[PDB]
Design a protein around this ligand. Sequence first.
Ligand code: MG
Ligand code: MG
Lengths: 420, 420
Amino acid sequence: SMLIREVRVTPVAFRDPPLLNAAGVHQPWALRTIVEVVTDEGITGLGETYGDLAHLEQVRAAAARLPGLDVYALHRIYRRVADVVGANIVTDMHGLTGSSSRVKTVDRVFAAFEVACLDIQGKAAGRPVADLLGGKVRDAVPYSAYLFYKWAGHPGKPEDRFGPALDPDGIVAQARLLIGEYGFRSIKLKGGVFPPEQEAEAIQALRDAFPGLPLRLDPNAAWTVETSIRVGRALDGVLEYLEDPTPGIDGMARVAAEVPMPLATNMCVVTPEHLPAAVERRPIGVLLIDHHYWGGLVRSAHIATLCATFGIELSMHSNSHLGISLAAMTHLAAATPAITHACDTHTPWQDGQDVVAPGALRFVDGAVPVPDGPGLGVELDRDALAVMHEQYERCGIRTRDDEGYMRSFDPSFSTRRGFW
Amino acid sequence: SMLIREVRVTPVAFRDPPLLNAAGVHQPWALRTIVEVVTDEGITGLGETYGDLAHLEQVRAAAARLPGLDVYALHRIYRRVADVVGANIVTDMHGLTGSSSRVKTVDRVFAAFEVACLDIQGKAAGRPVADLLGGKVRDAVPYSAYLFYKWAGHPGKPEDRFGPALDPDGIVAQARLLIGEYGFRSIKLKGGVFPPEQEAEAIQALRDAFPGLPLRLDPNAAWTVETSIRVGRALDGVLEYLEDPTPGIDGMARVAAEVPMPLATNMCVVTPEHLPAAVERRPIGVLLIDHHYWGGLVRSAHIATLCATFGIELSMHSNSHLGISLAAMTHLAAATPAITHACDTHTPWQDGQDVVAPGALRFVDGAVPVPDGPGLGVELDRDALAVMHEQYERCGIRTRDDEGYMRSFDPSFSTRRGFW
Ligand SMILES: [Mg+2]
Ligand SMILES: [Mg+2]
């Protein structure tokens, strides 16, 4: 039958190091919302989405209105989510995934349920979710090493095992650590933190220390058009791609026409309404897809086809996340021929924290093998979920705010947008 | 397990009346190829594609190379088809579905297998194919009445029950007949047969006889740009859309900018490589999708999303076909929010001929209810299949050739392309 009997919604918080970015610095707790869909038959599916309060409220509201719907009825579930969301538009405090909009809000709320319904469908059919998307075309999905400038620890808290990284030597050392542990064969540096000249230096140091590894640089729109063109030209032959150097479709397109490497985004093209203007102006050669705000795995796959058709290559964006998201990202990437670049992930930074069981997701030579077995291939660890929910209850954070947190230390700071 | 054990490929021929079009006249037999996929477990799926010899040869070749592959492994099946097809490009004799190309050839061969694999997946899960595409968003799929100018019968053969239609009165009478039987609430006229002024007259006669019913006119590119603009303007406020008035993206875009109704095509945009040029020039407001040459139901659904995003509405193209195709068309349309116009079908012209059982596909008030039960919801009638295969064996036709057939009667005829 496969009617939804109940939907359990659990906000969670987990530890995050002081990773610097254009919007400030990550807070000591990152938030997520875990969704568990249960059918009248007792088959369960998992999904995972943002933990910000306004989003959480919508997810709760939508979840309350899904019982009685069938898990194959994704169009109808999507319409029900759209009804709950109405014209409410949920906007985050950092802008690092671009502008908010109605459709993006609906897609963000829908995605945790869609992923859980696909998990259930996979379980019913006894197949991995990748088989629901046409079957895996690769056995394992390569991920990049996501490097950050960072403090040694959060002020007023213990220093972490990763150490500080505030110049090229530190960044190279961080890379050795991550590549040594996970085997990553691609490297991404989060920029927009230091003057561009210093971040270019870090990129060069990485190229020298790791010959042959594709490199990416992402200042989250911290640069002007002129600065972007200077840096792009100065990094000729070094970057796989330059990600969001400058804000806006117009600025991005102007940069793209004057630098030698392709530009990528997860800021100026973040919902389907953006695509026609993007095809016309060509601000990018590479779109980072993200099922968490493009509306689930199936909608993401549709956009992948659309991109390939217009000659836009695909990569994948990440936000701090747990293993349900990692499993979903991996089945999506494994089953989508057009996702050809290494995917981003924050996984190393969460240092083993998770709400699923241990032996399903592993990195081997920088890549995650598509899970064995039905559905997502992961199993909820209910005690770990309880532990993280208790942390959410007393962590004192309810909405991600990198900028507010940075301002607690430097009152004059503001999110860097066309700043250098 | 769901490994393909065998694939049965059966060419069939069935009776077709002398329907006139820009390329001449339909021959007395229409050809199709029926595909039946059988898993190691004995679960069967059906697909249906063109019967032209060169296509049939590719379908046979591909079918021989599918055993051992899993029915969920659609990406891998697609790659295997691409391997079999190589750089062979199969081109038909009439051009009524636009130019041939490698991808289109691969998609045409792949589609009969994809539809059969989805039928099997639906059977395994006990769900209709529409549930594999997100669930039906409408209970029944509206179809148009497909009107043709036609002779009373094929020369040297018995006249058919439909009668001749060679002027506006005849066309209106044909419409009364079809609408009376099937309940169609939209009307399409096949043109490019008579001078445009006479076909415009038929369109006007239809509007007067059937107030409120959307009307379409399709001359299959028989007109020049100037003639197209004249007719378009003369039919202001009458047409839902004007379909392929003139050949080529350039000509279509020039017409589209000077006529009051949207243009549609199944000739200048017929494979994904066409879409970027189409988005740039805007030759159309409406694309007729057709899973038989866009590469199956899932790929068709992807293109539907792409169209909606760029503001191109969707309709559906038909070629003479049987109930496996009708079932597939109906599940696709029912599960695709963007397919909003009535779909085309040749069903009435086949006057009950079919290779599936009787009680699954019916027209009620012009629309086909999505079938009840698992998979496509149709059951092969093996005796009917044998009957039509025996007809193929002795029908003396191996490739559709409307133009050659018309030339047997009028040696000076040539397919009309920018002729009026
Ligand atoms: Mg980015
Ligand atoms: Mg047409």
